[PDB]
């Protein structure tokens, strides 16, 4: 970090995070893979 400003920094490409649970299964009642859906 050669600059004080945070916008004047390298892109944080290294970090890898993900939460696909908020898109693929956003349902309230938990749905088990094994069990029937209903």
């Amino acid at each position: 970090n050669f600059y004080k400003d945070a916008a004047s920094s390298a892109s944080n490409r290294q970090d890898i995070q993900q939460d696909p649970g908020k898109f693929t299964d956003p349902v309230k009642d938990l749905m088990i893979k094994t069990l029937p859906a209903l």
Binding site: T24, P36, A37, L38
Partner: protein, 178 residues
């Protein structure tokens, strides 16, 4: 039928004719295939040059509650021609889907590839197989229900799916100043 709603629905009927003919058939590679290049799987895949992992096809049956049936959805890896009979198609990774209360089925295409990645563009070296659908038995409907139903298809990636080499999408095709 493309600039309409009839592009999404797959015509499935009850009859005596053409029960030894496929219901549908298309390329399994989601980048260049004229069926699933536009899906959310294919839209995010066309920004990339390489892709790996299993895709899965979910089939929602949009008929009546009294109409029952069984369907054979099969995947056959490349090397041979398209399966032309249900006998040749039940040799690939298939599923016999009984239609009832659940009314939905997932065919997981199991990623049978020679290499670790495949090209999104169409090249012979890394080409995916074929996804054909067949009548396992038939669609059977009561006297008063409508005899022509249709299956609605879905496609998404599995948890081991990954894309590998960034490129520009060919869809936008800007002509000039906006």
């Amino acid at each position: 039928k493309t600039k309409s709603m009839d592009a999404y629905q797959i015509p499935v009927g009850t009859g005596n004719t053409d029960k030894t003919k496929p219901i549908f058939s298309f390329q399994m590679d989601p980048g260049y295939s004229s069926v699933l290049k536009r899906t959310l799987l294919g839209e995010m895949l066309n920004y990339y040059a390489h892709w790996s992992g299993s895709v899965k096809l979910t089939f929602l049956f949009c008929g009546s509650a009294m109409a029952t049936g069984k369907l054979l959805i099969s995947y056959s890896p490349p090397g041979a021609s398209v399966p032309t009979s249900r006998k040749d198609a039940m040799l690939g990774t298939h599923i016999v889907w009984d239609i009832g209360l659940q009314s939905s089925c997932v065919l997981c295409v199991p990623w049978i590839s020679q290499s670790h990645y495949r090209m999104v563009q169409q090249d012979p070296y890394t080409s995916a197989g074929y996804i054909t659908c067949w009548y396992q038995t038939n669609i059977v409907v009561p006297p008063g229900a409508p005899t022509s139903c249709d299956v609605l298809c879905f496609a998404s990636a599995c948890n081991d799916f990954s894309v590998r080499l960034l490129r520009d999408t060919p869809f936008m095709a800007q002509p000039g100043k906006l």
